[PDB]
Design a protein around this ligand. Structure first.
Ligand SMILES: [Cl-]
Ligand SMILES: [Zn+2]
Length: 476
């Protein structure tokens, strides 16, 4: 026996879950206006589910073709992925001036999905692995954010584009790219006075020493010897050169440097990114990647569910709903429980980054370019079946009342196993809809979802189920 409290009025407490749910429909139908109606429609289909699947087989396959089309738009090919690789190397040049042993790791969807569309935000983690192993990483993050912001400003990033967030719970730097080849790999040094011949040789020397023997293609000076331009062999060499620290002979002679062009610039200037100093996101993305590569329909379904979850409002963490990570866990848990992918213990992905190699995320095409028309048709059929099955599983099979969506063990996790069978009751930690975070113990990804919010979520799962049986929440 326990207390249950309403999340939509401050006074309603009950001693049974049934009474709580009844209260939510009876007093708060304005908050969940389609719940009872869509539940009733989907409940008509349940006793005839196999018949429905059979009759709607062509439609379900058509939805699989659409799923693969949406997924294909996220796959911009290996060359586009390599643009993110170059940006990462560019950023690493910059951050090593702050901390020589820091290295830059990409995480997020380019890791989890093995593709990048050239537009999705890139996450960069900056970590000194030796220090992390000693238990001394990150250094004070507010100061790290300010230090790296200044280095970026000095290599040509504008305050228009850079947003230091030194005081968030996790301090980060956000870079917001503006919307609009030799020029892109060229830079300009402006000097505060004229350089002597010795000074010119020293500056050129500094550039050459930064990039190595093949890095410099052309160097030239203006008539007044107060600007030097340089074309480097690549955009990455161009950033490496702009990070040099000249030691000129003439007293008080100083340089400033930026790309030779205001819009045509190295990759790092052109992409949206969040820069952070912690390792946890790397591990999360690597766990997702292992699961999502293990069935050919797993990434396409994950992509369609991310978009669905945002459009339907169930993925909206700022207002207490789920995150994109939570939605991926829902999808993967379904895949594991239904036997579409093998179980992976989150503990199989090391916390330590000592053996890490994939700083640059490995590219895997969304669909095998060599499969046959027949095989492709079979993938469409499977993708549709799997997606309909996800909405059916969460609408009728999964026990939201007593169990937890969890990848931390292969079998069923009950709320009681995690101590989530009772709430401390306001804004309580809620255990209505439970999804266990793989690496943070005792964290419910549904902790802000009280009863009325949970019925909004259930509404959308019924709506998704019904929509995939018909000719839109899934519209681009
Ligand atoms: Cl999110
Ligand atoms: Zn209420």
């Amino acid at each position: 026996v326990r207390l249950y409290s309403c999340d939509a009025c401050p006074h309603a407490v009950f001693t049974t879950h049934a009474a709580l749910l009844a209260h939510a429909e009876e007093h708060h139908a304005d908050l969940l206006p389609d719940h009872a109606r869509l539940r009733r429609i989907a409940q008509k289909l349940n006793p005839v589910w196999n018949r429905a699947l059979n009759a709607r087989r062509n439609t379900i396959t058509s939805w699989g073709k659409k799923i693969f089309h949406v997924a294909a738009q996220r796959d911009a090919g290996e060359s586009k992925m390599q643009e993110a690789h170059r940006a990462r190397a560019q950023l690493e040049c910059v951050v090593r001036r702050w901390h020589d042993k820091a290295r830059v790791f990409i995480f997020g969807s380019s890791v989890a999905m093995g593709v990048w569309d050239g537009t999705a935000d890139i996450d960069f983690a900056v970590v000194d692995v030796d220090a992390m192993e000693r238990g001394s990483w990150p250094p004070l993050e507010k100061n790290a954010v300010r230090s790296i912001t200044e280095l970026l400003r000095r290599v040509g990033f504008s305050f228009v584009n850079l947003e230091p967030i030194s005081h968030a719970r996790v301090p980060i730097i956000k870079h917001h790219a503006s919307s609009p080849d030799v020029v892109a790999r060229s830079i300009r040094f402006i000097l505060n006075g004229p350089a002597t011949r010795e000074d010119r040789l020293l500056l050129e020397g500094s550039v050459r020493d930064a990039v190595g023997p093949t890095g410099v293609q052309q160097v030239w000076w203006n008539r007044t010897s107060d600007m030097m331009s340089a074309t480097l062999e690549s955009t990455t060499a161009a950033v490496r050169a702009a990070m040099c620290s000249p030691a000129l002979a003439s007293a008080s002679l100083r340089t400033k440097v930026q790309p030779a062009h205001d819009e045509c610039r190295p990759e790092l200037y052109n992409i949206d990114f969040d820069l952070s100093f912690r390792a946890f996101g790397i591990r999360n993305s690597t766990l997702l990647r292992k699961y999502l590569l293990s069935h050919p329909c797993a990434r396409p379904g994950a992509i369609v569910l991310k978009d669905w979850s945002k459009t339907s409002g169930v993925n909206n963490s700022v207002n207490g709903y789920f995150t994109s990570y939570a939605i991926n866990i829902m999808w993967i848990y379904y895949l594991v429980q239904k036997g579409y992918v093998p179980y992976v213990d989150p503990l199989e992905i090391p916390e330590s980054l000592v053996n890490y190699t994939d700083f640059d995320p490995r590219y895997t095409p969304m669909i095998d370019p060599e499969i046959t028309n027949t095989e492709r048709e079979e993938l469409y059929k499977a993708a549709g079946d799997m997606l309909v099955g996800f909405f059916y599983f969460y609408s009728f099979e999964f026990d939201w009342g007593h169990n937890v969506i969890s990848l931390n063990r292969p079998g069923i996790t009950t709320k009681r196993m995690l101590g989530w069978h009772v709430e401390d009751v306001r804004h309580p930690t809620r255990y209505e809809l439970c999804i266990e975070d793989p690496y943070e113990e005792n964290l419910n990804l549904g902790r802000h979802i009280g009863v009325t919010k949970s019925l909004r979520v259930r509404t959308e799962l019924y709506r998704g189920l019904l929509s995939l049986l018909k000719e839109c929440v899934f519209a681009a």
